[PDB]
């Protein structure tokens, strides 16, 4: 998975 | 003023229960895009990630350890929790709270940093 | 995990001389959003580490422009024209578009003799 960004 | 306190126990026993509380000020964990976060740092060692909960409870933890963490928060109180069940010496480190947002106009970024907490995780 | 992998971990350098550090990833730290999450910490003795350089290039607050950013994809370079006392500490790097969020081992930026 890959972490939160807008 | 951004401020983040982290506490813990300061000595535990292999295979005991690590609780560690973040108290921060001066942001609300409430507004949508925020985010807080751990991270530790073994004495004379490089920095490694541990777990990021989001405002809304969604949360991502470091694969390697994700059996033993659970991370939590409490929004009205300013205030984030780590769980690291059975720890060992190796688990034995500074402990910082971070903050961490999901937008560029609130800080997608580590730019607050707590002054950190010790455990020792010693028979 | 992503490697982020630091040459070197330990430079030597006089004061007013030009430092670099590479950085170099396991995977290209493009978020699927289109931006690169490559980020720079110093940390010193006995304190946290402090924000320097975000988005590969971008200074953060209070960072001279003595100190600069490059790279794309999965090699980086961190830059200082002319190094100063306050300067000398551990350099990280460090992506954060892929879980787990992974620095670099640390570089010491250290005094010549």
């Known amino acids: 998975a890959k972490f939160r960004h807008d | 003023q951004v401020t983040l306190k982290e506490s813990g126990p300061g000595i535990l026993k292999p295979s005991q229960t690590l609780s560690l509380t973040c108290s921060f000020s001066?942001?609300?964990?409430?507004?949508?895009?925020?985010?807080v976060g751990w991270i530790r740092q073994p004495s004379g060692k490089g920095l490694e990630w541990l777990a990021h909960?989001?405002?809304?409870?969604?949360?991502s933890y470091n694969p390697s350890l994700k059996s033993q963490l659970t991370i939590s928060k409490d929004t009205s109180r300013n205030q984030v929790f780590l769980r690291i069940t059975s720890v060992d010496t190796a688990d034995t480190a500074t402990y910082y709270c971070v903050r961490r947002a999901h937008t560029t106009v609130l800080g997608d970024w580590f730019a607050y940093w707590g002054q950190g907490t010790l455990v020792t995780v010693s028979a | 995990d992503v490697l982020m992998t630091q040459t070197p971990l330990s430079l030597p350098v006089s004061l007013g001389d030009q430092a670099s550090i590479s950085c170099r990833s396991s995977?290209?730290?493009?978020?699927?959003?289109?931006?690169?999450?490559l980020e720079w910490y110093l940390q010193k003795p006995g304190q946290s580490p402090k924000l320097l350089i975000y988005?590969?290039?971008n200074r953060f607050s209070g960072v001279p422009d003595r100190f600069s950013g490059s790279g794309s994809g999965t090699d980086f370079t961190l830059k200082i024209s002319r190094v100063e006392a306050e300067d000398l500490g551990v350099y990280y790097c460090?992506?954060?578009?892929?879980?787990?969020?992974?620095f670099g081992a640390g570089t010491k930026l250290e005094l010549k003799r």
């Open positions: 988005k590969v290039s």
């Open positions: 460090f992506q954060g578009s892929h879980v787990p969020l992974t």
């Open positions: 909960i989001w405002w809304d409870d969604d949360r």
């Open positions: 995977q290209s730290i493009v978020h699927s959003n289109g931006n690169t999450y």
């Open positions: 001066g942001f609300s964990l409430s507004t949508s895009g925020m985010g």
